[PDB]
Amino acid sequence: MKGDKKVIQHLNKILGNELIAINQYFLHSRMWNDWGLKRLGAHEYHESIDEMKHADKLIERILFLEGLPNLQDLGKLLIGENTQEMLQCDLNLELKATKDLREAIVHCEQVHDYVSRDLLKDILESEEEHIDYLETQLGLIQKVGLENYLQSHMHE
Amino acid sequence: MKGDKKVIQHLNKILGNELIAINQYFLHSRMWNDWGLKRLGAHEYHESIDEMKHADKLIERILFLEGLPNLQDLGKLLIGENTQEMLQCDLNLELKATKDLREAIVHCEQVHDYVSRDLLKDILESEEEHIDYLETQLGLIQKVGLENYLQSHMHE
Amino acid sequence: MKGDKKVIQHLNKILGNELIAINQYFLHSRMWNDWGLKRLGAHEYHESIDEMKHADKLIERILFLEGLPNLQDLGKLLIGENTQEMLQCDLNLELKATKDLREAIVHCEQVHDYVSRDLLKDILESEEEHIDYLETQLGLIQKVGLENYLQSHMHE
Amino acid sequence: MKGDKKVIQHLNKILGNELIAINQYFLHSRMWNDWGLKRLGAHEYHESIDEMKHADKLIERILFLEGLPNLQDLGKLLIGENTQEMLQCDLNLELKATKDLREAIVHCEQVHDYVSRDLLKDILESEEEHIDYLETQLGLIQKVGLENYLQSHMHE
Amino acid sequence: MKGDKKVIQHLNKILGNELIAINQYFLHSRMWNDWGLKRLGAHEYHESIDEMKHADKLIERILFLEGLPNLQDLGKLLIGENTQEMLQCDLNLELKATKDLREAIVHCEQVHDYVSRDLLKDILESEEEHIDYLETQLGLIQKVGLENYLQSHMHE
Amino acid sequence: MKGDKKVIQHLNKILGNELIAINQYFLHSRMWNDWGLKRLGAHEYHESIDEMKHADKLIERILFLEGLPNLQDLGKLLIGENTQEMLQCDLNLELKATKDLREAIVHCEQVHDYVSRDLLKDILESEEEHIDYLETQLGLIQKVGLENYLQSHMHE
Amino acid sequence: MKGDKKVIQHLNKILGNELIAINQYFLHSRMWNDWGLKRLGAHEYHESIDEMKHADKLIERILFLEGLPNLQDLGKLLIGENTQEMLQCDLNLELKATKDLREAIVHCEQVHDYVSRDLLKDILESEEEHIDYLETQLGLIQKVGLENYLQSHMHE
Ligand code: HEM
Ligand code: HEM
Ligand code: HEM
Ligand code: HEM
Ligand SMILES: O=C1NC(=O)c2c(NCc3cc(Cl)ccc3O)cccc21
Ligand SMILES: O=C1NC(=O)c2c(NCc3cc(Cl)ccc3O)cccc21
Ligand SMILES: O=C1NC(=O)c2c(NCc3cc(Cl)ccc3O)cccc21
Ligand SMILES: O=C1NC(=O)c2c(NCc3cc(Cl)ccc3O)cccc21
Ligand SMILES: O=C1NC(=O)c2c(NCc3cc(Cl)ccc3O)cccc21
Ligand SMILES: O=C1NC(=O)c2c(NCc3cc(Cl)ccc3O)cccc21
Ligand SMILES: [K+]
Ligand SMILES: [K+]
């Protein structure tokens, strides 16, 4: 079905954010696992998988709309050097991703691509859940102290 | 069954305390969950539910005694700004509630409303168990330190 | 995540309607049960529980958006004096509630808070189902007669 | 298998009656559900499904006989404004349909299409069962009164 | 609940499209079965059932909004004479239906009938799935050849 | 029970057709199996068994009517030497068989042998199902091409 | 455990190849699904998943050896425009990947990193299986023809 050209550009921009998130969260997961913080590693692993599922739905939507999904262009990963930095890097990416999602929804609404809007809204609901998780983790570090926070994330 | 006027006024006073407690505990619960202290959140939620069940029984007793349950007048919530304050606010409310239950029981005894007395005694038993819980939590904070106390209430 | 201030105000306004509805429907339920109209009493109980669940979600969303949920201010309960009036009081509350929901959705849309909109839409679907039910009950009173109508709501 | 042209025309006339009945019963069903007369709505829904099944078999037979089934021409629906009228409208359409079934059967027999006759007889048995149901409901309204009759059709 | 007059007119237009789709897909289904192309016949049968379910929901919504569902007016069916044309006919109807859905959604949004919008968005999602299926079938005919395409749809 | 003499002659004529059909379908089945077209072979085997079952019921009916079943006179088998011809031979036998069933039913009706008519009508329904199958197969050969058609009948 | 710097550089090159293959295979899978060639789409999906698991093991090994896994640099995807080209692009990438694996194993052996060698041998065994599959598909296209080959990959 011939999609709006600018909807497809937006969907490829969201997909681009997802490709970054996939790799950043996957690498953060494996860093946490290497460090023995397996509860963080498992949780971050699942965040990566959730982004992979989002990327799947975007690719499928783009192809249905007769566009070309862009899996070639990979933007800058934000990799922290300790747990607090890694969490803040994830949060910075999520905030950029939800900004882009909102702008994409605005355009989908204006050209009446209501199904593309519904897909982007569901992804945004997932991203706002991730934002809640990250903000909460960063606050927990302040409330229980870093050493306890990390201790609580050693074991699944 | 036409009840004693003052008994009903006592019952509506206790109900008023329950309405405060329901809302104060439900908000405390959701604050703790938002902060990632989910064990505190879950326990405080169950405390809110317990007060909801108490209020149901009081509403049911008032109506049987042919009074009008007061669900309109809501007293002042005591909302803390941190965990220790929230626990102490809960404790302050409970001590007021148990005072009011004792005075009402006295009056039920005097006019021989023994069933109302039994209901109130059952509620007083639950409220003393909550007081036990709250005093114990405040003591644990002193014994294990606030950061360890919070750490131990992150996960369920 | 720092929410829009007027979104938070709208959500607190929706929460305020829910707090009225919780108490109004609970009192109506317990009145219907006291009069032996247990089918009405049960259905109205479930309506109260539904509004409790909506309020929980609103409180959670407001806290996520870094606002203060208002559980202190209780508006005016509309309590009927017979079955027909009780149903009309519920319907009047519901119609005000759905007005406020739509205005809140407009504002969410305007500031691109699409997740808050989606939550309000879901609540709105639930409230329109309650209106359907209430309008239907009031029509049934006219079609079968009040005595038949009450007879049909004695037993669960 | 090349069928008799007038058999096919007769089958299309029966199909045409079924298309009317499908929509008339379905709308009557949803009206009754909207009014809270859910037992009438459920029964009328199953009448509508029964007519859909009859229409399927007719369409299949027509195509086997190398005719063109006519799903384009929709006759006048008879929609009531109250329960008694809706039942009488169904009954009126049923009497038209069974008259038409009888005439088609005569013709099938004359040209020795005994299989088409067998199908139409089965449909006729179903329609006479619907007539019994309809006549019985209209009789019950007189015997128990309209308000009791509707009361008895509120709940499934 | 009094609905917006133009929303109801839009809902009746969508319903009118569904009534065409129901009969057009059902006839196509039974033609394919008659020809021994049973996998197309089964798939098109389920398409027709899906439209029936959409029509039910539209009818229920129109009645709740105190409108009169229009099951009397039946537009032009598009019936192919071979498998390609039948698929192209379905696709032509679907493209008309989704245009009308988008216009109906616009009007629900403008009058704040967000629940009608949600229903229509769900139907639109289903229609775009059917469009994907249709476009894919027409593409496969080109990729595998007409004879193989039909061969692959003889058996379920 | 003494039957009408001409009914019994008609039943023996139908039995004679079945006896032809049993052997022709059984041999076509085993030819197809020998050729590796096992899906045709299996289906033709079941057509043969169906005819065996019809012949049983006719034999049983003739004996009840105190006639002598003729299992001695076997008419000409129509045996093809290729798939299309075998199917066309089956179709030609069926059309001759259904002609005879129609004339037999006419006579049973005339002399009021309504049970014999019902038996023959049931047999006629089965033969019209076989005619549908055969006509459909021949049509499929034209739509998908002979080589694909046979390919699709290699495997069960 | 401090690894050989050149081993890590090899591992990172292999990882680079995996990242290309993940995205190339995932896009090809979703293109095939969009074209209705679901058996190809599903098989290609499983190939993508396989490369994802390889990448995971390489990342984990690089971190164990105190290197930095490179998930930032994405080489050129080879995307076909039709099925034959897509398979040939997969095969060309695989032949590159296995050449790089052999040179990395040579180096692991020379510096006695026998565990890294064993991991790479296991990945090489998987890639040779994928090469077997791809060469076999391209041969099938020649043996059965493109139309039959594609037809055989429509359905799972
Ligand atoms: C375009 C980029 C990618 C896409 C679209 C993608 C997609 C997917 C999908 C759809 C799944 C299945 C999830 C499920 O159903 O539970 C999955 C699983 C997985 N992915 Fe990815 N992925 C991508 C990149 C990556 C990368 C770069 C890695 C590793 C660095 C990776 C590692 C994994 C793993 C380990 C699994 C689980 C496999 C299993 O079941 O054992 N993915 N991926
Ligand atoms: C008049 C004040 C209230 C009364 C009398 C009341 C009563 C009840 C009762 C009887 C239950 C069932 C508990 C059980 O037996 O499991 C319940 C459940 C619940 N209440 Fe309330 N309640 C009140 C206010 C509230 C408020 C203000 C909230 C939220 C702010 C709330 C949230 C809930 C929730 C989430 C549940 C659990 C529902 C479920 O089963 O999932 N309630 N309430
Ligand atoms: C030519 C007109 C129609 C035909 C031939 C037809 C045929 C059918 C058939 C064969 C079934 C399956 C029944 C079963 O065995 O369970 C069915 C189901 C149904 N039909 Fe129709 N139908 C028609 C029109 C309609 C219309 C106009 C509506 C709504 C206004 C409708 C609503 C339904 C529903 C709700 C179902 C049940 C689906 C489910 O199982 O969830 N149908 N129809
Ligand atoms: C007067 C002629 C025949 C009559 C009345 C007759 C009748 C029957 C009947 C009643 C059955 C049982 C059907 C069932 O399983 O439900 C049967 C089965 C069968 N018939 Fe015949 N049959 C006749 C001729 C033939 C011929 C000529 C052949 C082979 C050339 C044949 C081969 C078979 C086979 C293989 C079975 C399946 C038996 C089994 O495996 O249980 N029949 N027949
Ligand atoms: O990331 C990427 N997404 C893509 O679609 C893509 C490429 N497409 C090739 C192509 C295919 C078809 Cl079918 C039509 C026109 C085309 O140009 C090529 C390289 C990289 C990418
Ligand atoms: O919280 C509240 N409890 C109540 O009973 C109540 C109200 N009563 C109405 C009423 C009903 C009947 Cl049946 C008899 C006498 C009455 O006055 C009104 C507003 C708020 C409340
Ligand atoms: O209904 C009510 N909802 C509320 O949030 C509330 C109150 N908040 C206290 C508070 C806590 C924090 Cl952490 C930050 C700022 C604050 O003012 C106080 C009384 C009644 C209510
Ligand atoms: O209700 C309807 N039934 C139908 O058959 C029909 C139509 N037929 C098209 C057609 C197909 C073939 Cl294969 C042969 C000859 C034809 O004319 C067209 C519009 C509406 C209808
Ligand atoms: O397709 C149709 N949909 C309809 O509602 C309809 C009809 N309505 C009759 C009616 C009923 C009531 Cl209760 C109130 C006012 C009315 O005019 C009549 C014929 C055909 C149709
Ligand atoms: O793909 C990538 N893999 C990586 O390791 C990586 C980055 N690492 C940052 C870093 C972390 C630590 Cl803990 C120590 C030293 C460092 O420089 C940065 C950007 C992109 C990538
Ligand atoms: K009665
Ligand atoms: K083929």
Author numbering:
A (entry chain E), B (entry chain K), C (entry chain F), D (entry chain I), E (entry chain C), F (entry chain G), ...: 1 to 156
What is the paper's account of this structure, in its own sentences?
In , the iron storage protein bacterioferritin (Bfr) contributes to buffering cytosolic free iron concentrations by oxidizing Fe2+ and storing the resultant Fe3+ in its internal cavity, and by forming a complex with a cognate ferredoxin (Bfd) to reduce the stored Fe3+ and mobilize Fe2+ to the cytosol. Pa Bfd binds Pa Bfr at a site formed at the interface of each Pa BfrB subunit dimer such that the [2Fe–2S] cluster in Pa Bfd is placed ∼22 Å from the heme iron in the BfrB subunit dimer. The Pa Bfd binding site on each Pa BfrB subunit dimer is a shallow depression on the surface demarcated by residues L68, P69, N70, and Q72 from one subunit and L78, L79, G80, and E81 from the accompanying subunit, where Pa Bfd residues M1, Y2, and L5 bind. Small molecule derivatives of 4-aminoisoindoline-1,3-dione designed to bind Bfr (Pa Bfr) at the Bfd binding site accumulate in the cell, block the Pa Bfr–Bfd complex, inhibit iron mobilization from Pa Bfr, elicit an iron starvation response, are bacteriostatic to planktonic cells, and are bactericidal to biofilm-entrenched cells.
We conducted ligand soaking experiments directed at obtaining cocrystals of inhibitors bound to recombinant Pa Bfr. These experiments allowed us to obtain X-ray crystal structures of KM-5–25 and KM-5–35 binding to Pa Bfr. As has been observed in previous structures of similar analogues bound to Pa Bfr, , the 4-aminoisoindoline-1,3-dione (phthalimide) moiety binds at the Bfd binding site on Bfr with a conserved pose, establishing hydrogen bonds with the carbonyl O atom of P69 and the amide NH of L71. The linker and phenyl ring of both compounds interact with the cleft formed by the side chains of L68 and E81 in Bfr. The structure of KM-5–25 bound to Pa Bfr shows strong electron density consistent with KM-5–25 in several of the subunits, and although the phenyl ring exhibited conformational disorder in a few of the subunits, the subunits showing prominent electron density indicate that the Cl substituent of the phenyl ring is directed toward the floor of the cleft, while the hydroxyl group points toward the protein surface. The results obtained with KM-5–25 show that when the compound is present at the MIC, the rate of killing is slower than that observed with KM-5–35, and although the number of viable cells is reduced by approximately 3log10 relative to the inoculum in approximately 3 h, cell growth is observed at later hours. When KM-5–25 is present at 1.5 × MIC (limit of aqueous solubility), the compound is bactericidal, killing the cells at a rate similar to that observed with KM-5–35. The results indicate that KM-5–25 exhibits synergy with colistin (FIC = 0.36, 0.38) and is additive with imipenem (FIC = 0.63). As can be observed in Figure , treatment of the pellicles with KM-5–25 or KM-5–35 elicits concentration-dependent biofilm cell death.
